[PDB]
Design a protein around this ligand. Structure first.
Ligand SMILES: N#Cc1ccc(C(=O)NS(=O)(=O)OC[C@H]2O[C@@H](n3cnc4c(N)ncnc43)[C@H](O)[C@@H]2O)c(O)c1
Length: 530
């Protein structure tokens, strides 16, 4: 069902001290006991101390148990960023009930799939999420038998049930979860959904949190803004919301990543840390009048999910006044971080080095040969917080994991002389133009350096004579440059002639994935049909 680490690995990871003997609920209880009255979590109106958060989680756990959720059950958790997300997560952790961590952007196709694949006892959602009313969907989940109950935070009508009254139960003090148990199902973030369920276990996911918190300098004075969906691995655990809580910092909830909102929130709450994907970082760097906000509290911006090119990376410290950290991560495991004392050569041009000393990285060619230093190949990895299989997916798992347990990421990377990863992109985003390979990131980074370019993305399109030609989609800043002007600019930059895009499309926006990454797959489909 959930392939485990072989015994030799379990022993090593315990011996090394990576895997400790606490579940998520116990870890939060321990943190809360260190600083019970300090504010742990705040939104626009509500501010919860560690002690009140813990008590609210224990009461909700009692109410969920009364509603029929039992140790070993699964639920689909589909909430917007907020206090209820945190409370519900940790209440389920306490009960040993596993949440599938659905994104706000997920809709009926995904949510129904998750409920059915996991045999979820409940859907837990809100009266509104990401501009969508999920309540008709939730009623259809019940009517079709996708789940047995549907709990809604907010107003709803029968046969949906209300989540808020379950907080009135007497606090449950016991914890049913074991450190070796599956704690939750993360979701894959590939380009061919429906997302796959990723079993994360308490002890390994907590190692992910603790090690990330140390690398990122989290401490008691960390004020973390949720700039991405809390359900996502980056926001939740790297070090994320849970890392902040376990460091006894304070989490500031936001349901929006636009700089007009977030910059005011940073000034009001004296935010110190956040994490974004590159398209959102570009919005923050290009914020106009909003930059009048007092951002002086900001200490660290993590950027990952997709590569932040050096042109944009170089602007972070001058414009925002904070340190940059680049992060390569995946919900399946491996995180790579640039370090807080790393020189600019690493921070501007790489996506970090592996989090754990026991992360085993192999970069291989199509034949499975390990490539030479600085050469590009497929990233494969095994380690102390990287899964050995997706949940209940033996057929796919036989293809996605090597015989010796390495996860095949589908990412193309090289490694520099110090072990830092440099991500070319996804395997499917490669470009072969008449036999000449083109690094899309090289061309994109040059375009993004242009003063009237906001963002740029380069994809392949079919061509009878060359097999593939290239098309750059470019979001301008006014006054917008023409395709011809950008081609002249790339020439002035020294770009090789065959790397200049055959076609340049000026557009207002790019199609995006669930947490805001650019969907190159959607752009290629748009070209293919045309
Ligand atoms: N801390 C942390 C953290 C950060 C991001 C994710 C995340 O993005 N998870 S993910 O499961 O949604 O997607 C994974 C896939 O994103 C791509 N990718 C991610 N970072 C990339 C980068 N800096 N440069 C280029 N590509 C990157 C790869 O293709 C990769 O396989 C996460 O889980 C944790």
């Amino acid at each position: 069902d959930a392939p485990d680490w072989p015994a030799a690995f379990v022993r090593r990871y315990l011996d090394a001290g990576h895997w400790q003997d606490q579940s998520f609920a116990e870890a939060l209880a321990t943190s809360a006991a260190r600083h019970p009255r300090r504010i742990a979590l705040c939104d626009d109106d509500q501010r919860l101390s560690y002690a009140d958060l813990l008590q609210r989680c224990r009461r909700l756990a009692a109410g969920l148990r009364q509603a029929g959720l039992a140790h070993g059950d699964t639920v689909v958790l589909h909430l917007p960023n907020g206090i209820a997300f945190v409370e519900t997560c940790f209440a389920l952790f306490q009960l040993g009930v596993r949440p599938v961590l659905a994104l706000p952007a997920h809709r009926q196709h995904e949510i129904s799939g998750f409920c059915r694949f996991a045999e979820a006892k409940a859907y837990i959602g809100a009266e509104r999420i990401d501009g969508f009313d999920p309540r008709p969907m939730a009623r259809e989940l019940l009517a079709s038998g996708a789940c047995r109950m549907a709990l809604i935070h907010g107003e709803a009508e029968a046969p949906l049930q209300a989540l808020a009254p379950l907080y009135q139960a007497d606090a449950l003090e016991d914890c049913a979860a074991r450190a070796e148990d599956i704690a939750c199902f993360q979701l894959s973030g590939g380009t061919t959904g429906t997302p796959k369920l990723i079993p994360r276990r308490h002890r390994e996911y907590l190692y992910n949190v603790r090690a990330s918190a140390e690398v990122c300098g989290f401490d008691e004075h960390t004020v973390y803004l949720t700039g991405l969906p809390m359900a996502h691995n980056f926001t939740l655990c790297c070090p994320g919301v849970i890392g902040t809580l376990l460091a006894s910092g304070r989490v500031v909830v936001s349901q929006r990543a636009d700089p007009e909102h977030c910059f005011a929130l940073i000034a009001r709450e004296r935010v110190t840390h956040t994490a974004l994907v590159p398209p959102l970082a570009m919005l923050w760097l290009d914020a106009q009048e909003s930059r009048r906000a007092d951002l002086s509290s900001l200490r660290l911006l993590q950027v990952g999910g997709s590569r932040l090119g050096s042109s944009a990376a170089q602007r972070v410290e001058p414009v925002l006044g904070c340190q940059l950290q680049q992060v390569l991560g995946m919900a399946e495991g491996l995180i790579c971080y640039t370090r807080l004392d790393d020189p600019p050569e690493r921070v501007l041009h790489t996506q970090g080095r592996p989090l754990s000393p026991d992360d085993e990285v192999r970069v291989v060619d199509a034949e499975g040969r390990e490539v030479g230093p600085g050469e590009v190949g497929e990233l494969t990895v095994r380690g102390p917080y990287t899964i050995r299989g997706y949940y209940r997916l033996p057929e796919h798992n036989a293809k996605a994991f090597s015989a010796d347990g390495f996860y095949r990421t589908g990412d193309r990377v090289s490694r520099d002389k110090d072990g830092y990863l440099v991500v070319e992109g996804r395997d499917k985003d490669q470009i072969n133009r008449g036999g000449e390979k083109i690094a899309a990131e090289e061309v994109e980074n040059l375009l993004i350096a242009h003063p009237q370019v906001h963002d740029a993305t380069v994809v392949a399109m079919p061509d009878s004579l060359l097999g593939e030609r290239t098309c750059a989609f470019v979001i301008p800043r006014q006054p917008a440059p023409s395709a011809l002007k950008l081609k002249q600019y790339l020439h002035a930059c020294g770009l090789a002639a065959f790397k200049v895009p055959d076609r340049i499309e000026l557009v207002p926006a790019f199609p995006q994935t669930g947490i805001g990454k650019i969907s190159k797959k959607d752009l290629r489909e748009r070209l293919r049909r045309e």
